[PDB]
Amino acid sequence: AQSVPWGISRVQAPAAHNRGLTGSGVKVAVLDTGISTHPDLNIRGGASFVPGEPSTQDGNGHGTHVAGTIAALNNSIGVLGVAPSAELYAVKVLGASGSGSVSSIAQGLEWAGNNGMHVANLSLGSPSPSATLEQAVNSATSRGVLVVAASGNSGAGSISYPARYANAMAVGATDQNNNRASFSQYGAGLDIVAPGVNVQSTYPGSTYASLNGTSMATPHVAGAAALVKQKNPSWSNVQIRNHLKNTATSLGSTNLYGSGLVNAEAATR
Numbered sequence: 001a002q003s004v005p006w007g008i009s010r011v012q013a014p015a016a017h018n019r020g021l022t023g024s025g026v027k028v029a030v031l032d033t034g035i036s037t038h039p040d041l042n043i044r045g046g047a048s049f050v051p052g053e054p055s056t057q058d059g060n061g062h063g064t065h066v067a068g069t070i071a072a073l074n075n076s077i078g079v080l081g082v083a084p085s086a087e088l089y090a091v092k093v094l095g096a097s098g099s100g101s102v103s104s105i106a107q108g109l110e111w112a113g114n115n116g117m118h119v120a121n122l123s124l125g126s127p128s129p130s131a132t133l134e135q136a137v138n139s140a141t142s143r144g145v146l147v148v149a150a151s152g153n154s155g156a157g158s159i160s161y162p163a164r165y166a167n168a169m170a171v172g173a174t175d176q177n178n179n180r181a182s183f184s185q186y187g188a189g190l191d192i193v194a195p196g197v198n199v200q201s202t203y204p205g206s207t208y209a210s211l212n213g214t215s216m217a218t219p220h221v222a223g224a225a226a227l228v229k230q231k232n233p234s235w236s237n238v239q240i241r242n243h244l245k246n247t248a249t250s251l252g253s254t255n256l257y258g259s260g261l262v263n264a265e266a267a268t269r
């Protein structure tokens, strides 16, 4: 039996699925620790930019988990992604330890742009700025990619980099009530929020696990972007971003929530 995680229902993905919108034909890159082969995922390619770790398989778990929130397959097992037919690309920029370099991440962003990705999910961040990262976020954007990035887990009223750069769509985390998760960074530049507490998804070893974080929120929005792109294949990254914001469920307090809670039903109505 397939389970639909609370957050998948909260963003109203099944409503989109019932309109025939699943992310089919939309290329989504997961820039993370890799993606491990899993019965509830279809991985269509990718690349590694981590020195000494040339496989795209996930030695950490984080990337696999993020990937299933985007695109776990719609079937009789496991969980269900926001965009269960999205074309997943594993872009390994973080090592098995969970950390990487500005150089790896920028290389992944270059790859995403050059390989025609429609969405790049960056469930990663740092408190310190990077001109290299900024340039790379702008590069992927110029090449037509919608870059979606986590706000961070410090609980502070400023958001992490690269989410703080204008051309990254910054995503915060809500709890099961739609209140800001205690850890979710907020403040200037936050675009939108999504479920980020007790999020069940795919995990290495053909298993499932629950995790907390803005890293879990971010893929809900990357998946929503993919639904919108399937519906509107002529739309740019900016049009998609704007529509997601304009159709989000307002939570008030934009400092805390940005435009509010991402709503895949409203976005595909």
Ligand SMILES: [Ca+2]
Residues within 6 Å of the ligand: 002, 040, 072, 073, 074, 075, 076, 077, 078, 079, 080
């Ligand atoms: Ca499934």
Ligand code: NA
Residues within 6 Å of the ligand: 162, 163, 164, 165, 166, 167, 168, 169, 170, 189
């Ligand atoms: Na931003």
